[PDB]
Design an enzyme around this catalytic site. Structure first.
Site, mmCIF file in Angstrom:
data_model
loop_
_atom_site.group_PDB
_atom_site.id
_atom_site.type_symbol
_atom_site.label_atom_id
_atom_site.label_comp_id
_atom_site.label_asym_id
_atom_site.label_seq_id
_atom_site.Cartn_x
_atom_site.Cartn_y
_atom_site.Cartn_z
ATOM 1 N N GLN A 99 -25.841 1.562 3.113
ATOM 2 C CA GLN A 99 -24.934 0.420 2.973
ATOM 3 C C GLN A 99 -25.318 -0.659 3.948
ATOM 4 O OE1 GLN A 99 -20.773 -0.066 4.279
ATOM 5 N NE2 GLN A 99 -20.294 -0.397 2.106
ATOM 6 N N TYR A 185 -15.656 -8.525 4.894
ATOM 7 C CA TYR A 185 -16.878 -8.809 5.683
ATOM 8 C C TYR A 185 -17.548 -10.078 5.171
ATOM 9 C CZ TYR A 185 -15.502 -4.488 7.885
ATOM 10 O OH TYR A 185 -14.805 -3.502 8.513
ATOM 11 N N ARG A 232 -20.771 -3.227 -3.381
ATOM 12 C CA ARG A 232 -19.368 -2.881 -3.177
ATOM 13 C C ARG A 232 -18.518 -4.159 -3.085
ATOM 14 N NH1 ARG A 232 -16.059 1.430 0.831
ATOM 15 N NH2 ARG A 232 -15.471 2.638 -0.995
ATOM 16 N N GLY A 321 -13.201 9.396 0.548
ATOM 17 C CA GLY A 321 -13.577 9.046 1.920
ATOM 18 C C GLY A 321 -13.010 10.003 2.941
ATOM 19 N N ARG A 322 -11.732 9.807 3.262
ATOM 20 C CA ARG A 322 -11.076 10.658 4.254
ATOM 21 C C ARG A 322 -11.216 12.136 3.935
ATOM 22 N NH1 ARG A 322 -6.521 6.116 4.786
ATOM 23 N NH2 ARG A 322 -7.327 5.777 2.660
HETATM 24 C C1 LIG Z 1 -13.426 6.372 9.128
HETATM 25 C C2 LIG Z 1 -13.624 5.369 8.012
HETATM 26 C C3 LIG Z 1 -14.721 4.507 8.050
HETATM 27 C C4 LIG Z 1 -15.042 3.651 7.027
HETATM 28 N N1 LIG Z 1 -16.190 2.894 7.096
HETATM 29 C C5 LIG Z 1 -16.535 2.154 5.988
HETATM 30 C C6 LIG Z 1 -17.817 1.554 5.937
HETATM 31 O O1 LIG Z 1 -18.695 1.650 6.817
HETATM 32 N N2 LIG Z 1 -18.058 0.801 4.808
HETATM 33 C C7 LIG Z 1 -17.199 0.696 3.740
HETATM 34 O O2 LIG Z 1 -17.563 0.023 2.742
HETATM 35 N N3 LIG Z 1 -16.029 1.365 3.761
HETATM 36 C C8 LIG Z 1 -15.726 2.072 4.823
HETATM 37 N N4 LIG Z 1 -14.559 2.792 4.804
HETATM 38 C C9 LIG Z 1 -13.738 2.858 3.558
HETATM 39 C C10 LIG Z 1 -14.058 4.073 2.727
HETATM 40 O O3 LIG Z 1 -15.368 4.010 2.154
HETATM 41 C C11 LIG Z 1 -13.083 4.253 1.563
HETATM 42 O O4 LIG Z 1 -13.227 3.184 0.618
HETATM 43 C C12 LIG Z 1 -11.623 4.355 1.944
HETATM 44 O O5 LIG Z 1 -11.444 5.249 3.069
HETATM 45 C C13 LIG Z 1 -10.719 4.720 0.789
HETATM 46 O O6 LIG Z 1 -11.045 6.010 0.255
HETATM 47 P P1 LIG Z 1 -10.159 7.318 0.689
HETATM 48 O O7 LIG Z 1 -8.686 6.966 0.458
HETATM 49 O O8 LIG Z 1 -10.686 8.412 -0.224
HETATM 50 O O9 LIG Z 1 -10.451 7.578 2.147
HETATM 51 C C14 LIG Z 1 -14.197 3.605 5.890
HETATM 52 C C15 LIG Z 1 -13.085 4.468 5.839
HETATM 53 C C16 LIG Z 1 -12.791 5.336 6.903
HETATM 54 C C17 LIG Z 1 -11.654 6.257 6.782
#
Ligand SMILES: Cc1cc2nc3c(=O)[nH]c(=O)nc-3n(C[C@H](O)[C@H](O)[C@H](O)COP(=O)(O)O)c2cc1C
Ligand SMILES: CCCCCCCCO[C@@H]1O[C@H](CO)[C@@H](O)[C@H](O)[C@H]1O
Ligand SMILES: CCCCCCCCO[C@@H]1O[C@H](CO)[C@@H](O)[C@H](O)[C@H]1O
Length: 364
Positions: A99, A185, A232, A321-322
């Site tokens: 990414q 961003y 994205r 993600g989480r």
């Molecule tokens: C610890 C953390 C770090 C993240 N870092 C990024 C990142 O570097 N780039 C990005 O596009 N999204 C980032 N996200 C967003 C996740 O990719 C994801 O879209 C978001 O957590 C929602 O999905 P979830 O509800 O399954 O966690 C981050 C999320 C978390 C929790």
């Protein structure tokens, strides 16, 4: 879960299943130098039962960084650190995209060598914090700084930096790149009307607001091929301070523009933290007609919702993600209905292996 466990073609790649490990910043890069490292390679390889891994955001230059200790992709050492990650992941049988990140105004000078942040305009992101290294082992949260508006020449420079970062990702052994044009961003600061006050050809109208995205994507495609470029977007979340006045129009148009570039996937960040706006099915179906490649969604999905989104024709793949932070074997757990561990917020960012590589696989 039946459709979730079907393979899928992604350009020249065959992927094992429909599950994505989406980008997750962990701020574990080695210092000095913001270099991807052994612990990160273990971490990603532990999660390689995903169909696709998308790396955490990786900054394309020194002034593209938002958060302490995120890995870069612009020095030779940084490329080599990422190669250890991609070698580990590929040994497990998995595809991995890098990414490519430029945070624009969502940073603090402490993270960008004392420089003032850049953006489309001079608008500060409101009610937004990042974190910096304050000399302690834990992230120090701080308010973002007021950016300066990019010049023509700054735009050329950033495009060049994206282009080279894509080549660097290929040198590092990634299978492709994901352009981070989401979550408030830099590119998102151009797309969304309320973040862009420019009076030149990069603001006002919808075509002008999409121009920076168009030009960056064109350069990425020229460098590495459309089959290796994903993008994205975040049409409806606003947590990091970007709001568009007519997001259905703006983002349907963006999807159609990206379709014209033939990018290999489009990834929609449907939730950001606890910013979970209503995302109408009618809008999702419009995006599905506007963009005809692989469509990925992430944000508060579980097994049931993921399977439903695929079977309703809304998504081809779903990111978790989480849950992937705490469940290295998330695919097996989803398939069997094994209970999911929960992650520890305090070890999301910074530190070492604890809260990174020491979440176990499921054992009854
Ligand atoms: C610890 C953390 C770090 C993240 N870092 C990024 C990142 O570097 N780039 C990005 O596009 N999204 C980032 N996200 C967003 C996740 O990719 C994801 O879209 C978001 O957590 C929602 O999905 P979830 O509800 O399954 O966690 C981050 C999320 C978390 C929790
Ligand atoms: C194929 C079997 C060989 C496995 C190679 C294991 C490589 C682990 O490498 C180790 O990772 C640690 C972080 O966990 C670092 O602290 C060490 O410096 C690094 O050498
Ligand atoms: C320097 C990088 C070394 C990476 C070595 C591969 C790390 C992942 O190792 C994997 O961890 C899983 C536990 O989560 C195990 O169940 C798998 O059997 C194991 O191969």
């Amino acid at each position: 879960x039946q459709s979730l466990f079907q393979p899928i073609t992604l350009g020249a790649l065959t992927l094992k299943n429909r599950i994505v490990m989406p980008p997750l910043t962990r701020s574990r890069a080695s210092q000095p130098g913001d270099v991807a490292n052994h612990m990160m390679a273990i971490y990603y390889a532990q999660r390689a039962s995903a169909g696709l891994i998308v790396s955490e955001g990786t900054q394309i230059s020194p002034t593209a960084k938002g958060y302490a200790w995120t890995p870069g992709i612009y020095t030779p050492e940084q490329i080599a650190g990422w190669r250890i990650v991609t070698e580990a992941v590929h040994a497990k049988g998995c595809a991995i995209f890098a990414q490519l990140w430029h945070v624009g105004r969502v940073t603090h000078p402490d993270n960008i060598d004392g420089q003032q942040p850049i953006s489309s305009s001079t608008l500060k992101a409101e009610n937004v914090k990042v974190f910096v290294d304050n000399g302690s082992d834990e992230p120090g949260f701080v308010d973002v700084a007021v950016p300066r508006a990019m010049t023509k020449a700054d735009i050329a420079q950033v495009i060049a930096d994206y282009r080279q970062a894509a080549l660097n990702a290929m040198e590092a052994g990634f299978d492709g790149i994901e352009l981070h044009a989401a979550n408030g961003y830099l590119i998102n600061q151009f797309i969304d009307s309320e973040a862009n006050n420019r009076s030149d050809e990069y603001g006002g109208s919808l075509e002008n607001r999409l121009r920076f995205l168009d030009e960056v994507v064109a350069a990425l495609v020229d460098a590495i091929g459309a089959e290796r470029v994903g993008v994205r977007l975040a049409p409806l979340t606003t947590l990091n301070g970007t709001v568009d006045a007519d997001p259905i129009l703006t983002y349907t148009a963006a999807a159609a523009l990206l379709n014209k570039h033939r990018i290999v996937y489009l990834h929609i960040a449907e939730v950001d933290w606890d910013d979970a706006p209503d995302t109408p099915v009618s809008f999702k179906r419009a995006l599905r007609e506007a963009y005809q490649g692989v469509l990925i969604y992430a944000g508060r999905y579980n097994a049931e919702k993921a399977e439903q989104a695929i079977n309703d024709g809304l998504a081809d793949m779903i990111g978790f993600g989480r849950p992937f932070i705490a469940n290295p074997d998330l695919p097996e757990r989803l398939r069997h209905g094994y209970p999911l561990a929960e992650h520890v917020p305090a070890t999301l960012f910074g530190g070492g292996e604890k809260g990174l590589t020491d979440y176990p696989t499921y054992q009854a």
